[PDB]
């Protein structure tokens, strides 16, 4: 092990004693991967064991199974779960794989050499050695590109991902014409993050998703080769801190942003996160309620078209500021919502009361009714309900869990970026420990006021 | 010397009365923009239809209101989270009626506070100081972001965002508890502990140092030199190190505010606080009410009242 007397780092900063220990650092990272793979496998098998075919996955508080279901495994027409053995296979595979990674980490943390540069030059690396650092980034960049292409392969081959917008009903579909038009693929990137544009969260077609992964997959592999055969340019070296903590701070900041984006994706996107498995989105639940009553009242004998509300802005239907006909009520804020159950009734100009008056299919109703009841609203003790509700329902939208968890994760990792980045910059300057007590810069600065 | 270099120096100049920086280059204009509109709005802004129900709530000192009641009405519900730039509005009058100023102020304010955090580190690096003062300033910034951005987004409208006013702040707090029971959220509990504790620690530390330096000497060197340590009630050695004490003086409050901010963000995703309504039941099944149930009774009252004409359906899923 190590002691503070020889490192200057206390036990609460012990892992910081592994910065220059390449061999030990390898074991630490490899081991941590084992933990991640372990949970993926363990929790998956736990979910499979606690899964029941009489209830939707979202009602069973399952988060991992929805991911496999979206990949198009053990799912059928309407999102109905045919079998769960595929899910069991995934858990078993990850769990056993975690053992291999665990052994490697333990070895590279005990028997393995504390450093590798002395023995294995290829693995041997020193922070600041930009060339080597860029090469390492390249290798991992290629790996991520291959992973994205594996998804693209599963979409156009080896079966297909589940398409909630599939024609004549939602089910797994083999993407055959993935969007490769740069304008469409990169359009999302330049889209405003505000309402309507929804930036990249707006992606509603699997064709763009698979096509976008095609673009990112290629660029990452090409970028890896570039970083493998190129060294940072003068401008970069003069505008970046070359240190392990600095490199970590860059990753911390990036992963923190990715966390926030993932939170929004799980809360707004319904394509990449099928509402059939992940449950309805906040906007989806609201629109579903308006549709549920609109249908019920219309059947009772109410003209939803000319039904003035208390404010006079239409009880069931109204016009979006843009002009599109939208459901009335506070759901006006979610007028930009788009779901496979509501699209058929829509048309060039907002909703089509013709479809609403006649052509409303029973499933369009049943689905909306189910979504309305299973809204994302919930409590920490898992007491399902808008609020001020009695303890009767035990359900919290999986979307809520992912959105809340990843948001908090992103926030902390951003704070970690600020901590590591600032310390890295201060370390480079040399004032990380504190003031010289003899070269205090302020004492040499202008007396200001 | 290259003029751009000359400019770069002036920007990083520490001789400036108020250190300007690359962060300040964006912070100064953004905050100046938000301050100007806020002052004009809090004084002459016409009524705004925040609920998007064609019912405009009056604001600004000119249109009645007062220092306490006056506030900047949040954007209309109709706009929701849609971007509403002045140029998008057909007429400045429409921009005011729809509640555009609020969105503009918040956008030019959040950027400024984030740049303010970066400016803090910039000067610390220029002066040669440690770089974690901004991390402490991250706690307040995180809270502001949640009430003016994260929550508005999670709910799906800028109208949900806390109004820029005293009475508006109170309204935001009340409706929030009526829909999220923030009081029963463990994270808000941590935040209250942070502020209540921070005040306690501030009063004690201030009293100890004051009584000591009562006379450059160390904050407590005097009392330490006498050796009459108050271990009688301060029987401990954890904070014997001044650095250890000051660290805690910063960690306790900042970490608490971080949790309350995250708590608000989680509740923005409909993750309400503990719900123990009708949790205690007798042998035959009769519900034995508790203090929680009484709190629920109040929450119901605030809920049935909030937006008296802005609900056409029973469930408030929005």
């Amino acid at each position: 092990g190590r002691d503070q007397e020889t490192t200057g780092f206390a036990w609460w900063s012990g892992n910081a004693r592994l910065i220059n220990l390449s061999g030990k650092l390898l074991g630490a990272h490899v081991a941590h991967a084992g933990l991640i793979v372990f949970w993926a496998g363990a929790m998956n098998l736990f979910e499979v064991s606690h899964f029941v075919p009489e209830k939707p996955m979202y009602e069973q508080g399952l988060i991992l199974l929805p991911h496999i279901a979206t990949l198009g495994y053990g799912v059928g027409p309407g999102g109905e779960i045919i079998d769960t053995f595929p899910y069991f296979v995934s858990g078993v595979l990850h769990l056993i794989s975690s053992a291999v990674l665990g052994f490697g980490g333990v070895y590279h943390s005990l028997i393995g050499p504390e450093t590798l540069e002395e023995s294995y030059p290829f693995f041997g690396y020193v922070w600041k050695d930009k060339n080597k650092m860029t090469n390492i980034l390249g290798y991992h960049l290629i790996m991520l590109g291959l992973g994205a292409w594996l998804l693209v392969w599963k979409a156009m081959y080896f079966g297909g991902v589940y398409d909630t917008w599939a024609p004549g009903g939602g089910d797994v579909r083999v993407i055959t014409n993935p969007t490769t038009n740069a304008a469409v693929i990169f359009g999302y990137l330049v889209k405003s993050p505000f309402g309507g544009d929804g930036w990249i969260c707006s992606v509603d077609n699997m064709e763009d998703i698979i096509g976008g992964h095609i673009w990112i997959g290629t660029l990452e592999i090409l970028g890896g080769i570039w970083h493998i055969y190129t060294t940072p340019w003068p401008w970069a070296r003069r505008a970046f801190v070359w240190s392990g903590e600095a490199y970590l701070s860059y990753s911390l900041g990036a992963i923190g942003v990715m966390g926030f984006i993932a939170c929004c994706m799980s809360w707004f996107n319904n394509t990449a996160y099928p509402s059939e498995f992940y449950g309805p989105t906040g906007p989806e639940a609201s629109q579903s309620q308006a549709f549920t009553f609109l249908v019920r009242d219309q059947r009772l004998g109410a003209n939803v078209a000319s039904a003035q509300g208390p404010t006079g802005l239409g009880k069931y239907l109204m016009r979006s500021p843009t002009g599109e006909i939208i459901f009335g009520g506070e759901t006006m804020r979610f007028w930009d919502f788009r779901g496979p159950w509501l699209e058929p009734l829509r048309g060039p100009n907002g909703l089509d009361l013709n479809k609403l008056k006649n052509d409303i299919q029973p499933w369009q109703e049943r689905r909306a009714a189910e979504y309305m009841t299973h809204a994302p609203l919930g409590s920490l003790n898992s007491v399902g309900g808008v609020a001020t509700e009695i303890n009767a329902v035990n359900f919290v939208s999986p979307r809520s869990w992912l959105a809340c968890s990843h948001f908090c994760l992103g926030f902390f990792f951003f704070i970690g970026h600020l901590w590591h980045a600032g310390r890295a910059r201060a370390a480079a300057a040399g004032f990380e420990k504190g003031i010289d007590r003899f070269d205090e810069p302020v004492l040499s600065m202008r007396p200001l006021d | 010397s290259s003029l751009w270099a000359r400019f770069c120096e002036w920007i990083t100049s520490t001789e400036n009365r108020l250190y300007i920086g690359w962060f300040g280059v964006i912070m100064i204009p953004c905050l100046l923009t938000a301050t100007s509109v806020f002052i004009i709005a809090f004084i002459a802004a016409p009524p705004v239809d925040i609920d998007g129900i064609r019912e405009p709530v009056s604001g600004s000192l000119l249109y009645g209101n007062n220092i306490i009641t006056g506030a900047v009405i949040p954007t209309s519900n109709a706009i929701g989270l849609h971007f509403y730039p002045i140029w998008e509005a057909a007429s400045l009058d429409e921009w005011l009626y729809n509640g555009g100023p609020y969105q503009l102020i918040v956008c030019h304010f959040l950027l400024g506070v984030y740049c303010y955090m970066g400016r803090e580190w910039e000067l610390s690096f220029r002066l040669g100081m440690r770089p974690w003062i901004a991390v402490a300033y991250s706690a307040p910034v995180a809270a502001a972001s949640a009430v003016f951005l994260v929550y508005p987004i999670g709910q799906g409208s800028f109208s949900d965002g806390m109004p820029l006013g005293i009475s508006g702040t109170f309204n935001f707090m009340i409706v929030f508890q009526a829909e999220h029971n923030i009081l029963m959220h463990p994270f808000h509990m941590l935040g209250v502990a942070g502020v209540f504790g921070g005040s306690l620690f501030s009063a004690m530390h201030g009293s100890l140092v004051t009584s000591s330096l009562i006379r450059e000497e160390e904050t407590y060197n005097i009392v330490a030199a006498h050796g009459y340590f108050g271990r009688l009630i301060f029987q401990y050695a954890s904070f014997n190190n001044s650095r250890s004490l000051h660290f805690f003086l910063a960690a306790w409050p900042v970490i608490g505010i971080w949790f309350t901010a995250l708590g608000l963000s989680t509740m923005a995703f409909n993750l309400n606080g503990f719900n123990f309504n009708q949790s205690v039941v007798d042998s035959q099944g009769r519900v034995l009410n508790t203090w929680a149930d009484i709190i629920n009774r109040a929450n119901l009252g605030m809920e049935v009242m909030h937006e008296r004409n802005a609900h056409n359906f029973p469930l408030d899923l929005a």
Binding site: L448, D449 | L18, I43, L61, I67
Partner: peptide, 30 residues
């Protein structure tokens, strides 16, 4: 004119803050 009174108070407070930052006693003390 209550609004005029309120505006005066707000303006006055801001003015005090201004001089407190630019017309403050030189900080000869550390």
């Amino acid at each position: 004119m209550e609004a005029l009174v309120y505006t005066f108070l707000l303006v006055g407070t801001l003015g005090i803050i201004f001089f407190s930052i630019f017309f403050r006693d030189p900080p000869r003390m550390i």
